[PDB]
Each structure stands twice: as C-alpha cells, then as structure tokens.
Amino acid sequence: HMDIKKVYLKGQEEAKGWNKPNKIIIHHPEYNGSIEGLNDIMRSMGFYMIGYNFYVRKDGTVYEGRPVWATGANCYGHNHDSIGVCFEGNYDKETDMPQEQFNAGVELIKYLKSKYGINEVNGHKHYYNTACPGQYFPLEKMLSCLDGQLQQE
C-alpha cells in the first residue's frame, strides 16, 4: 500500500478512548507547513495533539496524525464515528489544489475505505456549520474519483 509517514507528535502519549468510524471527513486547516507545526498549533488551543487522523501535504506526502483507534477531535458530534483527513493549505483563498496532493488524497481515502469498510465521505461542511474544507476545495471532483461505480449509473 501507499507510504504513510510516522513521526513523533508531542502529546500522542495521551491518546485514549475509542472510535468506530463509518465516515471520512475532509478538512483543510488554513495552514501551510509540517504536521509537527500543525500539532504544536492545535496544542496551543486545547487539543492534546492534532485533531486530524491524517495530513496530506501539497507534494502528496501523507502523515499519520491522531491514531484512528483513539477518540477523535476533527468534527463536533463525530469524535467516536469518523476519520478526519486534513489537506495542507487554505482552500478559502487558494484556487488550485496540486494534482499530486489531490491524487494522494484519493489514494489515502480509497485505502481507508478498504481497511474500515467505510461508505460515506464528505466535507466537514456536510456535518457542521463551517466553510471547511473551503470554497475552492475540489470536493465534488474528489468524491467523483472515489465513486467510480457511478459511471455505470
């Protein structure tokens, strides 16, 4: 399977709780930089570690964040039923997702759909009063790549 990079995240020793995911929730953080930076930023605002389970970089590199076995902090009301996938950038201002990042996102979500037997994938905005993952995020195109069987519909 694809390379999922494993790095030490301050706070990951405090992972606890439970999660039975039946959905994948797509996010942006309005942030460019390393997963370590994002982890440290979220630890400054009441998270023990990064709220997201995976981070997909502009160059298509994928990092493991919060363990999926642990209680999540990616979406209010969905901490025990979801996988949070974050895409590097600010897609409320950035008009163009690099194709390397888009393809890595589809690869990761297909792999997770396979491992967890998950149907439902959508933007944060589907589940909560937010613009996340941003007005310019190619969300319908990405969901199109994930539902190939729809071409025979």
Ligand X SMILES: N[C@@H](CCC(=O)O)C(=O)O
Q: What letter represents residue 3's amino acid? A: D
The single residue among 44, 46, 77, 153 that binds ligand X, judged by CB under 6 A, is 46
Q: Is 66 annotated as a binding residue?
A: yes
Chain-centre distance for alpha carbon 120: 14
Give min distance, CB of 116 to Na ion, in A.
19
x/- site string to ligand X, residues 92 to 121, per CB under 6 A? Answer: ------------------------------
Q: Which stretch binds ligand X (CB under 6 A): 30-38, 42-50, 132-140, 143-151?
A: 42-50
What single DSSP character describes residue 72? Answer: P
Q: What radius of gyration do the chain's Cα atoms show?
A: 15
Q: Which does 124 bind (CB under 5 to 8 A by kind): Na ion, ligand X, Zn ion, none?
A: Zn ion
Pick out residues in 5-24 that bind Na ion (CB under 5 A). Answer: 9, 12
CA-based torsion, 64, 132, 119, 88: positive or negative: negative
How many residues touch Na ion under the rule CB under 5 A: the total is 2
E-only strand ranges, the chain: 4-5, 23-27, 54-56, 62-64, 82-87, 120-123
Place of tokens 């409320």: 92
Q: Which residues are annotated as a binding site for Zn(2+)?
A: 27, 124, 132
Q: Which residues are annotated as a binding site?
A: 27, 46, 48, 66, 124, 132
